[PDB]
Amino acid sequence: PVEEYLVHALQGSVSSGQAHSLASLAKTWSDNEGVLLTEKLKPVDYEYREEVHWMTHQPRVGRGSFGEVHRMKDKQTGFQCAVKKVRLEVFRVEELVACAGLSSPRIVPLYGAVREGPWVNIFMELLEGGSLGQLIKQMGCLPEDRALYYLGQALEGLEYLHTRRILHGDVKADNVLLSSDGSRAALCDFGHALCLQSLLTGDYIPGTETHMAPEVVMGKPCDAKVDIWSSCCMMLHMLNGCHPWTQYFRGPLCLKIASEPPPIREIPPSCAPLTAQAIQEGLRKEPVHRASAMELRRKVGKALQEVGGLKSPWKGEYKEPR
Numbered sequence: 437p438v439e440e441y442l443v444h445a446l447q448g449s450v451s452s453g454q455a456h457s458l459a460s461l462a463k464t465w466s467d468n469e470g471v472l473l474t475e476k477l478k479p480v481d482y483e484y485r486e487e488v489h490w491m492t493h494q495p496r497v498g499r500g501s502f503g504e505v506h507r508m509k510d511k512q513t514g515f516q517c518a519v520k521k522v523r524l525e526v527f528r529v530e531e532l533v534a535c536a537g538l539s540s541p542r543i544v545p546l547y548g549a550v551r552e553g554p555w556v557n558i559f560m561e562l563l564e565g566g567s568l569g570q571l572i573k574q575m576g577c578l579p580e581d582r583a584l585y586y587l588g589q590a591l592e593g594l595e596y597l598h599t600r601r602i603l604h605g606d607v608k609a610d611n612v613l614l615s616s617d618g619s620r621a622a623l624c625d626f627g628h629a630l631c632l633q634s635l636l637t638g639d640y641i642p643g644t645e646t647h648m649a650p651e652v653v654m655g656k657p658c659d660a661k662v663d664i665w666s667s668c669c670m671m672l673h674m675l676n677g678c679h680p681w682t683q684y685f686r687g688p689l690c691l692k693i694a695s696e697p698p699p700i701r702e703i704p705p706s707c708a709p710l711t712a713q714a715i716q717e718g719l720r721k722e723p724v725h726r727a728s729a730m731e732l733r734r735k736v737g738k739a740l741q742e743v744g745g746l747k748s749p750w751k752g753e754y755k756e757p758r
């Protein structure tokens with residue numbers, strides 16, 4: 437009964453507070469209200485409005501799929517961080533309910549979320565290295581040791597999420613952010629996230645088509661293993677410099693994911709045996725036979741050891757795709 441009253445006290449105002457208050461308030465998002473989780477972003481007289489209390493970077497350059505992520509600055513404190521705009525009308529409660537209260541170096545920290553009119557503005561740490569997607573484009577494709585190194589870090593994040601029965605729902609290079617030197621990778625974008633205990637029912641927004649697991653596309657029941665398939669599709673993208681399936685099939689790719697064998701022919705022949713063995717185990721069509729996050733993180737960790745550890749520089753020379 438008191439949660440009713442706690443929620444009412446948050447509605448109508450932007451406040452400094454904790455993750456659990458943000459989650460409580462976020463649930464009412466299917467007027468300027470919100471909760472800011474860091475001292476660096478401060479409301480002013482119950483408010484936190486764009487171009488008043490915080491401003492985006494000089495010419496408005498945008499990143500992510502929809503150009504919806506921006507560099508910003510709190511006008512009072514001068515602290516810079518990142519903001520992701522989500523339209524309120526299609527806002528998914530889970531995006532905040534999942535990541536709020538998490539604390540792992542493999543997941544990008546949440547700094548707050550403020551509703552203003554038709555927007556939900558979600559604030560987070562600005563990681564200056566850019567996404568792993570941008571790295572692949574710039575370098576053409578990644579060397580094996582660097583590819584393993586990041587896959588392992590992504591899988592560390594997934595262990596952490598899977599232990600709390602949270603599915604990421606859209607694991608890929610565009611959703612892994614790198615620190616300024618390239619040595620730390622963290623999962624971002626919980627817009628497709630999901631709490632656990634099939635996916636094709638009403639509320640569900642599907643992830644990236646190329647990285648979809650077979651049980652997702654056939655409408656079969658789905659668990660945390662979904663993410664593992666995606667992580668290995670991301671592995672192939674890092675190595676080959678292109679998504680799986682795109683090179684061999686032009687038409688609707690979700691029909692070929694269902695019928696065809698898993699894309700293990702796309703594993704480079706020059707990869708070391710345990711790299712190829714690891715990718716095969718994460719790309720088993722039946723989730724019961726497919727490696728878990730913990731299982732796969734351990735193999736990938738030894739696969740990296742088997743090729744002499746992380747040696748190649750962050751931004752080496754361009755390597756041509758397939």
Ligand SMILES: CN1CC[C@@](O)(C#Cc2ccc3c(c2)-c2nc(C(N)=O)c(C(=O)NC4CCOCC4)n2CCO3)C1=O
Binds near residue numbers: 563
């Ligand atoms: C914990 N939270 C809270 C909100 C969250 O669901 C998100 C997100 C999201 C989605 C797409 C993105 C991103 C986030 C994203 N975030 C950043 C960032 N935080 O810095 C960037 C990025 O690459 N920014 C900088 C790159 C260097 O130039 C300055 C901008 N991107 C570009 C990649 O597209 C989530 O996961």
